[PDB]
Amino acid sequence: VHIDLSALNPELVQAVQHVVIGPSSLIVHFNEVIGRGHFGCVYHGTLKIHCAVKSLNRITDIGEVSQFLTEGIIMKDFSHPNVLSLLGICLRSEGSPLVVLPYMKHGDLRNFIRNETHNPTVKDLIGFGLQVAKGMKYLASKKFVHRDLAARNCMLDEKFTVKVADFGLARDMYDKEYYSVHNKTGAKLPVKWMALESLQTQKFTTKSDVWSFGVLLWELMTRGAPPYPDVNTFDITVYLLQGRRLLQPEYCPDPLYEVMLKCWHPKAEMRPSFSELVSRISAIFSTFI
Ligand SMILES: COc1cnc2ccc([C@@](C)(F)c3nnc4c(F)cc(-c5cc(C)no5)cn34)cc2c1
Structure with a gap:
């Protein structure tokens, strides 16, 4: 999974730095599944901010990468105490991106x-x-x-x-x-x-x-x-x-x-x-x- 900034709506390019989590900033504990959806499992993760890290690897293909980022960018700007926030998305060499939510x-x-x-x-x-x-x-x-x-x-x-x-x-x-x-x-x-x-x-x-x-x-x-x-x-x-x-x-x-x-x-x-x-x-x- 590679990020092509040119592919995005040019208005959204600046938001990418604020949604993307560098792999060095996140540790994910794959040893125990804490949650399950149809699209994948979720695990404990540490960002020391405790988080829930959701895998999307049960999906065959994640779709257009530029759209996935756009969805993340739009989601991350939502902030309200009664709405679940997106902390960010983290890229991994092998497999789909990880979605990082507050625990x-x-x-x-x-x-x-x-x-x-x-x-x-x-x-x-x-x-x-x-x-x-x-x-x-x-x-x-x-x-x-x-x-x-x-x-x-x-x-x-x-x-x-x-x-x-x-x-x-x-x-x-x-x-x-x-x-x-x-x-x-x-x-x-x-x-x-x-x-x-x-x-x-x-x-x-x-x-x-x-x-x-x-x-x-x-x-x-x-x-x-x-x-x-x-x-x-x-x-x-x-x-x-x-x-x-x-x-x-x-x-x-x-x-x-x-x-x-x-x-x-x-x-x-x-x-x-x-x-x-x-x-x-x-x-x-x-x-x-
Ligand atoms: C069990 O420990 C936790 C703690 N925090 C989580 C945060 C998000 C999620 C995540 C990404 F799956 C999620 N995001 N929205 C929802 C949601 F609306 C419902 C659930 C859910 C419902 C059931 C039943 N199992 O998971 C999981 N959700 C799971 C967590 C699991």
């Missing part, structure tokens, strides 16, 4: 809320939801559409700060169960998180991210129950069109369920913005002790 001590949000070790309160769970909403408000303000928002796709650091993850160079399928193959297009889709219109057109928007966020809130309040367990894959469209939504979890406050129903409005344009979600959830959160 997230407590892993993905779904597994965290399912863990018997931890006991977040209803207030804590709502706060996790608020943090996600803030990250998504940021991403939406950058006109970035996530396309795969779900509890499995957010992570928690050592201070229990929630970060929207699984985007840009960290994008992957980290739990294959929840992705079904479309018969016409072949795309593997997170159907149980998708908006009605996306199930029909396969177009994703910020308003379809809002639908997914509604599902994520439901996951939080059920402590990571699988949505629609008694529905099979693409029959979700028929199920929803019967006039159905996920039921109100026992400990979900009534106004938070109302927020969920708004996220699942049949008219995409009538769903709340992430700014409105931050406002509404902040209020509900403030009522708890």
Whole structure:
């Protein structure tokens, strides 16, 4: 893997020095896999900054190198406390580049809320939801559409700060169960998180991210129950069109369920913005002790 600066959009050339990590600056501990995606494994690494280093060597070919760099450059300029940051990319003589992310001590949000070790309160769970909403408000303000928002796709650091993850160079399928193959297009889709219109057109928007966020809130309040367990894959469209939504979890406050129903409005344009979600959830959160 060689970097040809001329091949890039000339406006981005200056950003390369800030995204590329010199191999001498990074040590990666390949002895133990700490995480797995469809595109490769992840390992502990030290930059002493502790990091998660993701290999992309399960992919046959990584595509256009200039595009990969461009994706990295665009990703690295995102900075928000509820969005996973890119520390950089590191080139290795043999194999694809390594993607270098901050280490997230407590892993993905779904597994965290399912863990018997931890006991977040209803207030804590709502706060996790608020943090996600803030990250998504940021991403939406950058006109970035996530396309795969779900509890499995957010992570928690050592201070229990929630970060929207699984985007840009960290994008992957980290739990294959929840992705079904479309018969016409072949795309593997997170159907149980998708908006009605996306199930029909396969177009994703910020308003379809809002639908997914509604599902994520439901996951939080059920402590990571699988949505629609008694529905099979693409029959979700028929199920929803019967006039159905996920039921109100026992400990979900009534106004938070109302927020969920708004996220699942049949008219995409009538769903709340992430700014409105931050406002509404902040209020509900403030009522708890
Ligand atoms: C287990 O220890 C860690 C610590 N930090 C990590 C940071 C990123 C990642 C990385 C690059 F895979 C990643 N980036 N975004 C996501 C994400 F949204 C979800 C997951 C994830 C979910 C499951 C289940 N396993 O991994 C992994 N993700 C993995 C880490 C693993």
